[model samples]
Target: HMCDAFVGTWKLVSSENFDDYMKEVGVGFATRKVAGMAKPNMIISVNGDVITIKSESTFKNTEISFILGQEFDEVTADDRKVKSTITLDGGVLVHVQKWDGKSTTIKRKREDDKLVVECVMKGVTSTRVYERA
Candidate 1:
């Protein structure tokens, strides 16, 4: 399965346009500053049909567990309560979250020995690159 490619621990190497993406998502200035400076480690694992992604960092930590194509409630790091869904499309993992008519999509894919995460909200897109650890 494509999920097998993502089942590992990854450390963030670089991030681009993350602050702007956070702003678009209604994150406050102070929180945005902290979030912008925090380099998080992503841990991905699978159990049966459930996939778990845990983000660890000094500023904040968040995790989500879900089955493919199932909708669930999520409380984001920025403190938004959203409906979330995860699906596998081709080789990419597509995660969509919606709250109060606003939505964001985060696409994760394995690129060789690295993990590339694309976070999108409105017209802003942020990319965070991670290396397997």
Candidate 2:
């Protein structure tokens, strides 16, 4: 069966606030504040085991795609997504992308009518939950 719960568009509702998660990450305080308060937009496209996460905001537009249980390099806004691996951690999808020693861990899951994303890097982590738009 197809789960529309993860399809369509959504509005960012809440995000966990953190500093080191922002500072060393080069995210300015104003940007952090905006990121913390601002409700970003998201669109997820799932085709069978393939999934794409599109996060669009006033600041940036980031899109990532991968198969449910495969590894591939992902390009960033700078067009550099390297040695990325994505797989299903149960119902949620987990990704571990590596660029040297700096690796990012991301988890996506559907809760109610929302898609929640939790990103973790080093000791810093941030979570964003999106509601249907």
Candidate 3:
């Protein structure tokens, strides 16, 4: 299964341009500061047709469970209540969240034994790399 490739705990190795991405998403300065310093572990699991991704961090923790191509309500790490969906595209998990006329896309893919997460809001983009734990 495609989800099998991401079915383990991943520790954040590094992040780039996260602050600017957060700013583009309208996150407050204090929240962005904490978010920038927080390195979260991503725990991915599959149960039947549902996939769960958990973000565990000292600052905050958030999780979501969904079946591919289904839409659901999501409260993000920055506390935005958004409509979200996840879909598989060319072996990549593409996650999108929309709310209040704004939206963001997060793409997760396996690359050379690492998990790379790309976050995009408007024109700003942030890359977060993770290694298996």
Candidate 4:
């Protein structure tokens, strides 16, 4: 069930070093303030070759759907438009985004009853843990 491992709604459990990662990625101070206080929820749905991930938060609502290895334009929560690709390995869902030749990487994996997400941008790394809701 690797392809469907991410198919569920999850509530934020904890986060580490997210603000620094956002700052490194050029997110404004005010936006980062609100983002730091936001308790976001992620909803993931997998239907065959299509996978959709929805991030709902008090600051913004971001939804993205992609198929493996497909390239598309992605507008991030911080409002940056970038070219992105989705890839899969085992149960991990990885998304790589490029803009101005800079890249950001995000990986999501299911572990037991939780989802672990690791995000890296401009050499800063952040981890977010979520529980099934």
Ranking of predictions according to lDDT: 3, 1, 4, 2
Tens-digit lDDT track of model 2 for 2-21: 34566789998777744456
The reply for model 3, stretches above 4 Å from the true place, is: none
| lDDT per residue (tens digit) for residues 40-95 in model 3 | 99999999999999999987999999999999999999999999999999999999
Query: What's the alpha carbon RMSD for model 4?
Result: 1.2
Candidate 2: segments with Cα more than 4 A from true spot = 1-4, 24-38, 77-80
Q: What would the C-alpha RMSD of candidate 3 be, to one decimal place?
A: 0.6
- What's the lDDT for all of these models? 0.94, 0.72, 0.95, 0.90
> What is candidate 1's lDDT per residue for 36-114, written digit by digit as tens?
9988999999999999999999988999999999999999888999999999998899999999999999999988899
lDDT of candidate model 2 versus the reference: 0.72
Of the two candidates 1 and 3, the one with more favorable lDDT, higher being better, is 3
For candidate 1, the 10 contiguous residues with the lowest summed lDDT are 1-10
lDDT of 3 at 75: 92
In angstroms, the error of model 4 at 32 is 0.6
Checking candidate 1 for backbone clashes, the offending pairs are none
Clashing pairs in 3: none
